[PDB]
Design an enzyme around this catalytic site. Structure first.
Site, PDB file in Angstrom:
ATOM      1  N   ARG A  29       0.778  -1.243   0.000  1.00 41.35           N
ATOM      2  CA  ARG A  29       0.000   0.000   0.000  1.00 41.35           C
ATOM      3  C   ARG A  29       0.817   1.306   0.000  1.00 41.35           C
ATOM      4  NH1 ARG A  29      -5.099   0.090  -0.255  1.00 41.35           N
ATOM      5  NH2 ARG A  29      -5.033   2.278   0.426  1.00 41.35           N
ATOM      6  N   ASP A 137      22.942   1.520   6.983  1.00 42.72           N
ATOM      7  CA  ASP A 137      21.555   1.792   7.355  1.00 42.72           C
ATOM      8  C   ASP A 137      20.865   0.543   7.923  1.00 42.72           C
ATOM      9  OD1 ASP A 137      19.154   3.233   7.629  1.00 42.72           O
ATOM     10  OD2 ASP A 137      18.644   3.154   5.490  1.00 42.72           O
ATOM     11  N   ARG A 141      13.483  -1.943  10.010  1.00 40.35           N
ATOM     12  CA  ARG A 141      12.732  -1.548   8.818  1.00 40.35           C
ATOM     13  C   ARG A 141      13.417  -2.039   7.529  1.00 40.35           C
ATOM     14  NH1 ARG A 141      15.208   3.020  10.807  1.00 40.35           N
ATOM     15  NH2 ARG A 141      16.954   3.709   9.492  1.00 40.35           N
ATOM     16  N   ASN A 142      14.739  -2.296   7.561  1.00 41.40           N
ATOM     17  CA  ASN A 142      15.462  -2.746   6.381  1.00 41.40           C
ATOM     18  C   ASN A 142      15.675  -4.261   6.306  1.00 41.40           C
ATOM     19  OD1 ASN A 142      15.670  -0.453   4.770  1.00 41.40           O
ATOM     20  ND2 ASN A 142      17.288   0.356   6.077  1.00 41.40           N
ATOM     21  N   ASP A 155      17.856  -3.133   1.870  1.00 38.79           N
ATOM     22  CA  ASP A 155      17.957  -1.689   2.018  1.00 38.79           C
ATOM     23  C   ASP A 155      16.860  -1.057   1.184  1.00 38.79           C
ATOM     24  OD1 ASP A 155      18.585   1.009   2.316  1.00 38.79           O
ATOM     25  OD2 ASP A 155      20.757   0.689   2.185  1.00 38.79           O
TER      26      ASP A 155
END
Ligand SMILES: C[C@@H](c1ccccc1)n1cc(-c2cc(F)cc(F)c2)c(=O)[nH]c1=O
Length: 258
Positions: A29, A137, A141-142, A155
Site C-alpha cells: 500500500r 543503514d 525496517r530494512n 535496504d
C-alpha cells in the site's frame, strides 16, 4: 561511461524478454515507496523498486548480484531502460519488513522467535562483512520476512538513532559501526518495534552517548542478550564484537533459552 563497467554489468541487466512489471500494483500500500509487483518468467514473484550516479549504480549492481546467503535479500537483477527510471529487481517478501511485522498488534512472536530473528540478522551481517560490504543503514525496517519467516537483510531507504558515535562525529562508516546499529536492531526486536531514545531528540543523541548513556534493557529481554547490546555500543569501535562473535553468542543464548 567506462566501457569495461558496461561489459561487467551486462550479467546483472534484465529486460522485458523475462520481466513483466505491474506498475499499477504497488507493494504494501505504499510502505516501501515506488516498489511494484513484478513477475520473472516458469514464474517468480518479485519486487521492482523504481529509482555520474549511473556509474555507481552499475558498480553496486555487480557487487549485490554476487550476494548468495539465506539471510541476505538477493539482487535478481537491474533495468537500465532508454526511457524511464532505473529499476532494481528483488525477490518478493511475503511478510514485508521486520519493524512493521513485530509492531503489528495482530502478530505476536515469542521472546525466543525475536531472538531467532536477531540470530538471522547477525548471520546475514556476518556474510555481508565477509565481503567488506558496509551497510550504513541497518535497522529492523530494512530487514525482510519471507513466506517461511526467514529474515533477509535488505535496504529500502540520516538515521541518527542507529548510528555509531564515530559515524555521528566523523561521518565515516565501517563494519564496526554496523555492529552498533545491529545492537539497536536487537533492541527494536526486544521492544517489538518501539522507537529508540524516545526522550532524546536527534540533535542531542551524540551528547547522550558521550555521557556513557545507552538504551535501557527492555522487559523480557534476557540479561545475556542485553550484555551483547552493550558490547555493540562500545565507544571504541575496535572493541565491539564481530558479526562472527555475535552469531556464536546469540546461537548459545538461543539454544539454551527457557
Ligand atoms: C540486494 C538488496 C540488498 C541491499 C543491501 C544489503 C542487502 C541486500 N537491495 C539492493 C538494492 C540496490 C541494488 C542495486 F543494483 C543498486 C542499488 F543502488 C541498490 C536496493 O535498492 N534494495 C535492496 O534491498
Amino acid at each position: 561511461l567506462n566501457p569495461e563497467l558496461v561489459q561487467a554489468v551486462q550479467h546483472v541487466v534484465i529486460g522485458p524478454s523475462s520481466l513483466i512489471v505491474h506498475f499499477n500494483e504497488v507493494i504494501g500500500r505504499g510502505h516501501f515507496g515506488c516498489v511494484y509487483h513484478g513477475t520473472l518468467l516458469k514464474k517468480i514473484h518479485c519486487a521492482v523498486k523504481s529509482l555520474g550516479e549511473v556509474s555507481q549504480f552499475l558498480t553496486e549492481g555487480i557487487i549485490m548480484k554476487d550476494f548468495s546467503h539465506p539471510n541476505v535479500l538477493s539482487l535478481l537483477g537491474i533495468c537500465l531502460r532508454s526511457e524511464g527510471s532505473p529499476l532494481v529487481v528483488l525477490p518478493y517478501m511475503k511478510h514485508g519488513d521486520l519493524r512493521n511485522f513485530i509492531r503489528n498488534e495482530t502478530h505476536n512472536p515469542t521472546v525466543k522467535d525475536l531472538i531467532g530473528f536477531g540470530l538471522q540478522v547477525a548471520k546475514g551481517m556476518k556474510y555481508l562483512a565477509s565481503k567488506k560490504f558496509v551497510h550504513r543503514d541497518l535497522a529492523a525496517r530494512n530487514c525482510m520476512l519471507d513466506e517461511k519467516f526467514t529474515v533477509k537483510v535488505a535496504d529500502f531507504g540520516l538515521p541518527v538513532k542507529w548510528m555509531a558515535l564515530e559515524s555521528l562525529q566523523t561521518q565515516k562508516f565501517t563494519t564496526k559501526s554496523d555492529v552498533w546499529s545491529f545492537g539497536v536492531l536487537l533492541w527494536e526486536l526486544m521492544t517489538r518495534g518501539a522507537p529508540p531514545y524516545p526522550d532524546v531528540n536527534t540533535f542531542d543523541i551524540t551528547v547522550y552517548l558521550l555521557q556513557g548513556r545507552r538504551l535501557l534493557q527492555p522487559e523480557y529481554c534476557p540479561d545475556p542478550l542485553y550484555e551483547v547490546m552493550l558490547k555493540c555500543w562500545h565507544p571504541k569501535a575496535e572493541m565491539r564484537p564481530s558479526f562472527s562473535e555475535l552469531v556464536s553468542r546469540i546461537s548459545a543464548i538461543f539454544s539454551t533459552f527457557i
